[PDB]
């Protein structure tokens, strides 16, 4: 059943990288208005 | 009597071959099924690794375009 | 009756030799099947290793390009 | 005579099963060994992937730390 | 001696019967390594036909992006 | 009495062999036919590659033409 | 009286059953090697098609680079 | 032997696409100096 397991990792790795990209995009959005003030 | 002895010997020999052939029935099937499975899994893990790369690159870009579009609209508003 | 009792035995042993040889052959094939599966699976494992490794490079390169295109874009935006 | 001849033939056949049997056993061992190495290969592929995911998140965070830092530097100078 | 003969023959049927049985089992497997393989082959062929379609789209998209980045680059260069 | 059972069982194995040698032939037809199918599938792939290399290059030249008409036409008018 | 012929019927049967066993084996040789070859060649096509995409994209980007590095240097000279 | 016949066509297709890209890259180079004159 390992075969599945690594496949689960592929399908939940994808999710974590997408999540990190979205938070990256949110961090910059929250970073902009502070950058203009400084 | 020698003949008889040969007959006792050939019978045992021919029953130690049913057994041998059945072991090799059983081993083949088992082994091939495992082989199959492993192989298929490797190609899933390599047909999805590539989809994953494609979707990761698209979103990444897309997102940047979104940042250069809604961020740009912020300045006009 | 013993002669018939030897002829049947020589048919049976002939029919045993036939079965054993069809089994030997069988066995040689199984041992050659194995080599092939040690080289298709080896090839696929090498292929997936090269793919993961180069997928890592692709993602890192796109990340760096993304950074360099974003930094200049902010710089350029401030000037106009 | 025939008897003796038959015996000889039979002797050859008798050998030809022990080897076959012996070899079946060898085959079985090797199959199993390969099964075990394939089990370790999937586990080596698994660590790799997770290592890579960690690497990618570290690089995301450095990237985000970095450009932002540069901007800050510009604003302080 | 016939009793002997009959038993040679009843026993004869006993090894042969199993011969057929085994054979039957292998045929069952065979029809199992053919249906399965057909489906496996279909899957792999699907993969190549969809990667083909995917590769074509990737090359076309990169060509269009190349054309849009070159056109603007020349126009921007003329202005500065 | 035993001979009647034996002859029925033998008839009862001839049918099985006949069945088995009938079905084996059916399996052999399934195989040859499959060889024809796999070959046909590879042929389409080849054409699809030469279609895809045709679609790709005309576009290439095509693209270039578009570029000339986006720059050259502006100069004329 | 049938017994002698029963011995014969059986003989015919085992002349054919072994033959079935031979043919069956031959069909598994012929359609085993063929499937490994077909699977291996499709896997290699799919792998090299993927590699071909990577090399094609790399050169494209480098074409851009070289049409902007050396073209840019043309204006300064 | 059709397998070798598809692999060779893949390689030839790679070569032809690279050749078309280079030719493209040469056509624009020969196009520039004419563009500046017009
Ligand atoms: C442990 C290591 C990991 C640590 C990590 C730490 C490393 C440090 C980082 C330094 C890197 C920096 C280096 C500079 C980076 C620049 C590179 C770069 O960046 O080049 C870009 C191209 C891809 O180009 P690309 O990624 O831009 O292409 C997209 C995608 O198409 C998307 O979907 C598009 O969409 C999108 O554009 P969009 O429209 O805006 O969305 C476009 O980006 O990569 C390549 O060069 C691929 C190379 C092939 C190599 C060739 C051969 C190798 C093949 C060999 C195999 C032979 C095998 C058979 C063997 C058979 C089996 C035995």
Residue numbers in the entry:
A (entry chain G), H (entry chain H): 198 to 235
B (entry chain A), D (entry chain C), F (entry chain F), G (entry chain D): 159 to 235
C (entry chain B), E (entry chain E): 156 to 235
Publication text:
TMED9 is a member of the TMED family of cargo receptors that facilitate the bidirectional transport of membrane proteins at the endoplasmic reticulum (ER)–Golgi interface via anterograde COPII and retrograde COPI vesicles. In addition, all TMEDs share a conserved domain architecture with luminal Golgi-dynamics (GOLD) and coiled-coil (CC) domains and a single TM domain. Sorting signals for COPI (dilysine motif, KK) and COPII (diphenylalanine motif, FF) coatomer proteins are contained in the cytosolic tail of TMED9.
An unexpected feature of the TMED9 oligomers is an intrinsic symmetry mismatch between the CC and TM domains. In the homo-octamer, the TM domain consists of a dimer of tetramers, whereas the CC domain forms a dimer of trimers; for two of the eight subunits of the TMED9 octamer, the density of the CC domain was absent. Specifically, we noted that each TM tetramer has internal twofold symmetry, and twofold symmetry is also evident between the TM tetramers. In contrast to the symmetry of the TM domain, the CC domain formed obligate trimeric coiled coils, as was also predicted by MultiCoil. Within the TM domain interface, residues L214 and L225 constitute two layers of Leu-mediated hydrophobic interactions. Within the CC domain interface, four layers of Ile/Leu-mediated hydrophobic interactions are centered at residues L161, L164, L171, and I178.
